[PDB]
A = this chain, B = another copy of it.
């Protein structure tokens, strides 16, 4: 299909962080943002957003831990490859 890009994590505190990204050039119906500990696939949490939202602020993360964020665009039953990034919370 057609994915997002330029995922960037800001203001990483002890248990919070700001995620920002750029929407796809092609029209899409929605966007799937997934986050959680990098070595725990049963920890992932996902939200479905509109193409007009460009950032989230996350809370309740665990201190000094490495998380991975994946953002995938969707249109019908077509999903774009994910754009991901990683970051670790303060210690």
Contact: B76 with A76, CB < 8 Å? yes
21 contacts between A and B (CB under 8 A): A3-B23, A5-B25, A14-B32, A15-B82, A23-B59, A25-B25, A26-B27, A39-B42, A40-B40, A40-B42, A44-B90, A45-B52, A47-B47, A47-B48, A47-B49, A51-B60, A52-B60, A54-B57, A59-B79, A60-B80, A62-B79
* Chain A residues within CB distance 8 Å of chain B: 1-3, 5, 10-16, 18, 20, 22-27, 32, 34, 37, 39-64, 66, 70, 72, 75-83, 90
| Binding site secondary structure of chain A | loop
New contact pairs (19) apart from A23-B59, A42-B42, CB-CB < 8 Å: A1-B27, A2-B26, A2-B27, A3-B23, A3-B25, A12-B41, A13-B44, A14-B34, A14-B72, A14-B82, A15-B72, A22-B81, A39-B41, A39-B64, A47-B48, A47-B49, A52-B59, A53-B56, A63-B79
